Amino acid sequence: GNAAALDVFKFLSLQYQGKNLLNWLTEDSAEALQALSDNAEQAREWRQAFIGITTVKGAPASHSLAKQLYFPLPGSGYHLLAPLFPTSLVHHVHALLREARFGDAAKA
RNA sequence: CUAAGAAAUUCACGGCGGGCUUGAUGUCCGCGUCUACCUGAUUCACUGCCGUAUAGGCAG
């Protein structure tokens, strides 16, 4: 999304009492859902807003510049298979490779 | 029906100033290389004659 609104991301990914705010706002926790709003309706609308950030926004669409690859079905058929870039996998492999190539134990 | 489908990197350029690498040196003792074979298979498509002949025959 926007590169200037990422402050709410680090505010939402906080670990105040031991774990993330996401699981706190998914469940009906008494500790959460009241520290942010004095009114119940404000708490509800803020909760739906902060939880819908992990859901798909809009209709499912893959652009023309995106890749779509036919895969032949076993019996007389095809599926379209538009793949998305696994940024989580490349981040995890980047962390592993950075540890292997520039880590303290590795360079030792 | 292919991480599908598409694409101009490119213009210009002084690398050179100079220099002692030299001194010395024991390679070395010893040694059983044997045994047994058909080169030759049409392996000399050769020399001469009749005929203008490359066409085609003939002589030892």
From Swiss-Prot:
Disruption phenotype: Mutants lose phage DMS3 infection-dependent inhibition of biofilm formation while there is normal biofilm formation in the absence of phage infection. Decreased production of crRNA in the presence or absence of phage. Disruption of the entire Y.pestis-subtype CRISPR region disrupts crRNA production but does not alter phage resistance (possibly OLNs PA14_33350 to PA14_33310, and the flanking CRISPR loci), indicating this CRISPR is not involved in phage resistance.
UniProt family annotation: Belongs to the CRISPR-associated Csy1 family.
Subunit structure: Interacts directly with Csy2; part of the Csy ribonucleoprotein complex with a probable stoichiometry of Csy1(1),Csy2(1),Csy3(6),Cas6/Csy4(1)-crRNA(1). A Csy3(6),Cas6/Csy4(1)-crRNA(1) subcomplex is also formed.
Remaining remarks: In this bacteria, Y.pestis-subtype CRISPRs do not confer resistance to phage DMS3 or MP22, but instead are required for DMS3 infection-dependent inhibition of biofilm formation and possibly motility.
Role: CRISPR (clustered regularly interspaced short palindromic repeat) is an adaptive immune system that provides protection against mobile genetic elements (viruses, transposable elements and conjugative plasmids). CRISPR clusters contain sequences complementary to antecedent mobile elements and target invading nucleic acids. CRISPR clusters are transcribed and processed into CRISPR RNA (crRNA). Cas3 and Cascade participate in CRISPR interference, the third stage of CRISPR immunity (Potential). Involved in crRNA production or stability.
Protein name: CRISPR-associated protein Csy1
Entire protein: shown range: 110 to 217 of 434
